[PDB]
Amino acid sequence: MMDYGIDIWGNENFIIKNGKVCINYEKKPAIIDIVKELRDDGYKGPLLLRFPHLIQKQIENIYGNFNKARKEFGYKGGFNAVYPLKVNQYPGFVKNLVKLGKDYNYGLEAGSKAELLLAMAYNNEGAPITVNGFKDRELINIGFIAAEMGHNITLTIEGLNELEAIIDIAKERFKPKPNIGLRVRLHSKFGLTSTELIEAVNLLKENKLLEQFTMIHFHLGSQITEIHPLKKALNEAGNIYTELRKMGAKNLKAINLGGGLAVEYSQFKNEKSRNYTLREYANDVVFILKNIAEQKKDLEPDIFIESGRFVAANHAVLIAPVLELFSQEYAENKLILKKQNPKLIDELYDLYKSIKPSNALEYLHDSIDHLESILTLFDLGYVDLQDRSNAEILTHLITKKAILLLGVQERYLVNFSLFQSMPDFWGLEQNFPIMPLDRLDEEPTRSASIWDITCDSDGEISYSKDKPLFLHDVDVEKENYFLGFFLVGAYQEVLGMKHNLFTHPTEAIISINEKGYEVEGIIEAQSILDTLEDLDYDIHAIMDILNERISNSKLVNDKQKKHILGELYLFLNDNGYLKSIGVLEHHHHHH
Amino acid sequence: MMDYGIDIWGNENFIIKNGKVCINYEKKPAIIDIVKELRDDGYKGPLLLRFPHLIQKQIENIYGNFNKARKEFGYKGGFNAVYPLKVNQYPGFVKNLVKLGKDYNYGLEAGSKAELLLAMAYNNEGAPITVNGFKDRELINIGFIAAEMGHNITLTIEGLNELEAIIDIAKERFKPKPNIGLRVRLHSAKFGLTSTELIEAVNLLKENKLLEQFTMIHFHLGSQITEIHPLKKALNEAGNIYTELRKMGAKNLKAINLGGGLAVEYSQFKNEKSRNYTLREYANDVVFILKNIAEQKKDLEPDIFIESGRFVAANHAVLIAPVLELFSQEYAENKLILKKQNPKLIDELYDLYKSIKPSNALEYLHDSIDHLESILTLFDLGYVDLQDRSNAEILTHLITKKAILLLGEVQERYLVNFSLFQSMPDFWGLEQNFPIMPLDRLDEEPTRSASIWDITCDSDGEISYSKDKPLFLHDVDVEKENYFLGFFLVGAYQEVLGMKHNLFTHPTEAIISINEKGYEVEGIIEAQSILDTLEDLDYDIHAIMDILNERISNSKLVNDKQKKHILGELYLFLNDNGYLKSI
């Protein structure tokens, strides 16, 4: 039945149980259950859940494949994984990654002073720390102190200039010096050219520092959908590696492939995100290198990958409850029975009646045209708003009955921000799998196009032919309906633009074991007041003025002004996310 | 001479003086001067400058045109401008906008609880406050208290549901009730009330005796509308909805909110305008279209309400960033490696090089490249070494360059100290291009096809050179002198969308005031320190220092004497911003 492609992007990490999606780990805890509990604890609004277990699965999944790949071709070189902090620096992830990847000697990558410091604090002693990006004397120095501190740090040079800087401060610091890495410029736009690489080696040689040159690195970019570019790159780099060793760089014993390992985001049959498998990527790496090592009869290099997206993507799920259900309301009774109807809508009537399986497709054509002519007349002021209404309703009825005789449904408003938790959606084509948390045992019957609570119309995940999304027809006020956005654990939080001040949603870390699951490490969403302060507003001032305006107001009495204060203070200390509007009173006699 | 199109996007707000760009206001203070001063005060790294004066110019520029447009056609209806906070909520702007737009009764627009509160605090009493977006009982209630507070607030309904909510809590609150606005769904734009829904909306208000509140209809076409036609098509349709609604009993309906859309000129290249219309044209069109409809339906000329935020906020801010280093191509013969026996492919490259001439120039160019492609293919196969590869690249480049010479790519890449994801997200997100020009040395002619890039690993963070975007910068010596670049019209949507990539936090910002005496720096906000940044991610600063302190102490690669020294440095770097210093 409808599984929302949970088998494509989901892998064996997520499974559907009693009509509800769960974490395929121990008792297969349902996400909808964890959500409910958190809501009971008073955590409403959108929430981001982190599942450390998934992080572990991913780590052992990377090491798992590369090891099996190494054994297959009997690769003598070693393998090591590094995590580029740039894809997600949030403690809720980083703290777990270093912890879970300890047994694997998983390292950390930094590309700024801020990240390097972080890395220097949480990276397990002994694990490698690579450093990319442009560096100044300060960054190089701190890299050095990281070495003196006992860390396995490697400074990757982006240009000869940086190399010189290191050489200089090298003879200025102490005995402990960091490892030097050279970023190669691939001809398959930063890095050292072939001629620059040679100079680089001579410089290190002149200053007796070849001992430091231990690895070359190249980056092709993130989410590489094709496997060919990687093979073309690895090959070129592999030869640069050997050539550099033959040049005297005896300590050069590793190649850093960088990132690029793609993640499967597709949730629709016949639309894979990447055309290759992890094992394929690993086998290809080990093979290409082995071959080159043999040809040049040199030493098989140590493999270093900095795949962050892959290891961080699935660890986080963004759950958001459906606030409202805006559908296409067009009942025949809505027709303002006019007395003297304009010819155009008159024809629309005749069509709605005479419509039959034979002239169905035809009528549909004509009906549309009529609506177009009426609208054009409306803008010319030749028809009243009732007419326009009639036209639109009839047109819809005709179009409806048309498809019926032939042989979007609703727009779900989700309590979250498509700019806050999912920037890659607005920034690029990046699409995240979306599926309800429960009611999966039932077949959805509503071509949906979910949109967030934002003025900007550019904030909605519209329905598509290639992206046919169907959600169950539920009653927001009668029951609860939560949506889940998966694989949102990479690059989304870091790129959380925070549009209409909608701050990061509440996040919680879910631990799972044989006993069950246990919520922990909750970070509640900021209050409006806190948010304003973060923009550098004077909270104290804002309250004084607010307090004053209510007091000096002459539209309400003291009694009321006090009441107002109570509310105002409640709203200030509350998060800015919207709440369901709920049931509305009936102001008409009924029974 | 080279003015970087300062006349296109610059308007009469920026002018070039003694070879340096300045604020065309009083003594025409040069930006490069203000920067220097701030650097002398110890504020290095990238800085965002805010010029309140520009904000004023813009406000009086909007009211100016709409007023002159109203007088031209003798429009009886009034005009009012509102500022959508969503385009920039930073105090450095907002506090100045409300202040400078007070005399104009400039209002504020909010689209969230957070923004509404803000608005309720800073919006001048009496000025209008419009509220768009989806609302829950809470947002509606606070809107109501804003009314009771004495504010001129209007709640714009997005759906019948919201209307009902208001109606309900209406008879629950007190006498003071907010004004009700209806967002119309335009059949020429997504959200809003359909024609049939609008009627129901009116009936509901009528049944609950609330027509008194329905005072304006609103529609939004979106931001940065480059074409004027869609606006005219919209205004027309809305204009008729307006009249029809009044004829339906909505007597209090006396205003139309056009929303945003007024485009800003970002183009700095001749023959490449961002918008095809002028502000006056936009104004004249609005006043005309409405007058006509009001006359045809012989109804009341509506009050004009616009919520153009980008227009009024764009130019107020300039992002200045110093050039840390220039990267070029070290291609010269002295780079060639005289090998005793080298591949015949590079042998041909030599001959080709010494045999080049006007006659065979264009031919040799082609052949030189093919040969390079060959040598490369061979390198990837392990048939040539790195030296050969180096010689090939050197020769090919030499030949290619010596070719263009005889025949009747980017010359240099500039490493600017800033983030193309932090201060300029609209660049990565969309096509959005911001004018770029040096702060000084303008009296000289630039001679370097440049492609400036920021200090970030991600290669997707660079403003590459283009045929349609031919950027030229002066050939300067980073270590010999200072060279600052300026990114203009960055005061809208950029800071709010400051992704903050590799943790590069918002740069230091300062508010520059200008008068007859000169300029005066004030309201400086220094850039966060690494430590502060880590805390903002919810890291335990105290913990991080303890562990860092401990690792140095228990280290066995350095002595006590040294460990103490390390500590001193470590603490200095922690309390410093994360931007690069110098190279």
* β-strand pairing of B453-454 with B413-416: parallel
User: Which chain A residue shows the shortest CA-CA distance from B241?
Assistant: A385
| Pairwise CA distance, residues A279 & A296, whole Å | 26
Angle in degrees, CA B543, B548, B549, rounded to 5: 100
Our CA-based measurement puts residue B165 at a distance from the nearest CA of chain A, in whole angstroms, of 7
In this structure, which CATH number among 1.20.58.930, 3.40.640.10, 3.30.365.10, 3.30.200.20 belongs to the domain A330-408?
Answer: 1.20.58.930
| Pairwise CA distance, residues B527 & B531, whole Å | 11
E strand map for B411-515: 413-416, 436-438, 453-454, 484-487, 508-514
Phi, psi for B537 (deg, rounded to 5): -90, 5
Our CA-based measurement puts residue A71 at a distance from the nearest CA of chain B, in whole angstroms, of 25
C-alpha neighbours within 13 Å on the C-beta side of residue B514 = 22
Q: What is the CATH number of domain A526-576?
A: 1.10.287.3440
Give the domain B333-410 fold: Methane Monooxygenase Hydroxylase; Chain G, domain 1 (1.20.58)
Our CA-based measurement puts residue B341 at a distance from the nearest CA of chain A, in whole angstroms, of 17
Phi, psi for B272 (deg, rounded to 5): -170, 30
Query: Residue B442 corresponds to which amino acid?
Result: L
The second-level CATH assignment, the architecture, of B52-316 is: Alpha-Beta Barrel (3.20)
What is the maximum alpha-carbon separation in chain B? 100
What sign does the dihedral A192-A195-A196-A198 (CA atoms) show? positive
Interface check A114 vs B, CB under 8 A? yes
Angle in degrees, CA B288, B291, B296, rounded to 5: 125
Pairs of CB atoms within 8 A across A/B: 334
Identified catalytic residue from A331, A337, A380, A455:
A455
Check the annotation: does B309 bind a ligand: yes
Beta bridge pairs of residue A443? none
| Pairwise CA distance, residues B573 & B283, whole Å | 53
| Pairwise CA distance, residues A409 & A388, whole Å | 22
DSSP class per residue in B259-294: ES-B------SSS--S-SS-HHHHHHHHHHHHHHHH
Residues B199, A336 contacting (CB under 8 angstroms): yes
Query: Residue B517 corresponds to which amino acid?
Result: K
Q: How many CB atoms lie within 10 A of CB B392?
A: 27
User: Which chain A residue shows the shortest CA-CA distance from B556?
Assistant: A150
DSSP class per residue in B407-421: ----SBEEEESS-TT
| Pairwise CA distance, residues A588 & A239, whole Å | 82
Q: What is the CATH number of domain A3-51+316-329+409-525?
A: 2.40.37.10
User: Which chain B residue shows the shortest CA-CA distance from A161?
Assistant: B583
Query: Residue B17 corresponds to which amino acid?
Result: K
| Pairwise CA distance, residues B498 & B504, whole Å | 10
DSSP three-state, residue B115: helix
Our CA-based measurement puts residue A483 at a distance from the nearest CA of chain B, in whole angstroms, of 18
Check the annotation: does A222 bind a ligand: yes
Check the annotation: does A365 bind a ligand: no
Our CA-based measurement puts residue B193 at a distance from the nearest CA of chain A, in whole angstroms, of 11
The DSSP H or E segment spanning B519 is: strand B519-525
Give the domain A52-315 fold: TIM Barrel (3.20.20)
Question: Is A379 in Cβ contact with B240 (below 8 Å)?
Answer: yes
Task: Give catalytic status of residue A455 as yes or no.
Answer: yes
Interface check B120 vs A, CB under 8 A? yes
The DSSP call for residue A448 is: B
Q: Domain spans of chain B? A: 3-51+317-332+411-528, 52-316, 333-410, 529-583
Resolution in A: 3.0
Our CA-based measurement puts residue A579 at a distance from the nearest CA of chain B, in whole angstroms, of 6
| Pairwise CA distance, residues A290 & A57, whole Å | 28
The DSSP call for residue A324 is: E
The DSSP call for residue A340 is: S
Question: Is A550 in Cβ contact with B149 (below 8 Å)?
Answer: yes
Question: Is B537 in Cβ contact with A145 (below 8 Å)?
Answer: no
Phi, psi for B169 (deg, rounded to 5): -65, -5
Residues B449, B486 contacting (CB under 8 angstroms): no
Residues A484, A465 contacting (CB under 8 angstroms): no
Instruction: Provide CB contacts within 8 A for B136, sequence distance 6+.
Output: A323, A578, A579, A580, A581, B165
The DSSP H or E segment spanning A130 is: strand A128-131
Picking from B118, B499, B539, the nearest residue to A532 by CB comes out as B118
Residues B391, B346 contacting (CB under 8 angstroms): yes
Question: Is B297 in Cβ contact with A111 (below 8 Å)?
Answer: no
- Judging contacts by C-beta atoms under 8 Å, the chain A residues touching residue B295 are none
**What six digits make up the tokens of B502?**
């590799």
Q: What is the CATH number of domain B3-51+317-332+411-528?
A: 2.40.37.10
Question: Is B581 in Cβ contact with A137 (below 8 Å)?
Answer: yes
Phi, psi for A175 (deg, rounded to 5): -60, -55
Check the annotation: does B102 bind a ligand: no
Question: Is B330 in Cβ contact with A196 (below 8 Å)?
Answer: yes
CA distances to A230, B293, B304 from B80, rounded to whole Å, are: 58, 20, 6
Interface check A413 vs B, CB under 8 A? yes
Size of chain A, expressed as the number of residues it contains: 591
DSSP three-state, residue A230: helix
What sign does the dihedral A457-A461-A466-A469 (CA atoms) show? negative
| Pairwise CA distance, residues B317 & A375, whole Å | 43
Question: Is A413 in Cβ contact with B134 (below 8 Å)?
Answer: yes
| Pairwise CA distance, residues B549 & B545, whole Å | 6
Q: How many CB atoms lie within 10 A of CB A174?
A: 16
Q: What is the CATH number of domain B529-583?
A: 1.10.287.3440
Interface check B580 vs A, CB under 8 A? yes
Q: Which of B182, B91, B76 is nearest to B130 (CA)?
A: B182
Question: Is B236 in Cβ contact with A114 (below 8 Å)?
Answer: no
Question: Is B114 in Cβ contact with A326 (below 8 Å)?
Answer: no
Query: Residue A271 corresponds to which amino acid?
Result: E
- Judging contacts by C-beta atoms under 8 Å, the chain B residues touching residue A137 are 581-583
Chosen from B44, B108, B113 to mutate, greatest number of chain A CBs within 10 A: B113
Interface check B581 vs A, CB under 8 A? yes
**Can B333-410 and B529-583 be said to share one CATH topology?**
no
| Pairwise CA distance, residues B421 & B463, whole Å | 11
Q: Which of A123, A497, A85, A10 is nearest to B426 (CA)?
A: A497
Quickly tell me which residue has 């030493």 as its tokens.
A299
| Pairwise CA distance, residues B410 & B416, whole Å | 16
| Pairwise CA distance, residues A521 & A544, whole Å | 34
Interface check B241 vs A, CB under 8 A? yes
Q: Kindly provide the b/e burial profile for residues B285-296, where b requires at least 16 CB atoms within 10 angstroms of the residue's own CB.
A: bbbbbbbebbee
What would you report as the CA-atom Rg of chain B, rounded to the nearest whole angstrom?
30
Phi, psi for A297 (deg, rounded to 5): 40, 50
Per the rule left: phi > 0, alpha: psi between -120 and 50, beta: everything else, A297 is: left
| Pairwise CA distance, residues B185 & B257, whole Å | 13
User: Which chain B residue shows the shortest CA-CA distance from A326?
Assistant: B159
| Pairwise CA distance, residues A367 & A344, whole Å | 10
| Pairwise CA distance, residues A508 & A312, whole Å | 16
The DSSP call for residue B450 is: B
Question: Is B190 in Cβ contact with A457 (below 8 Å)?
Answer: yes
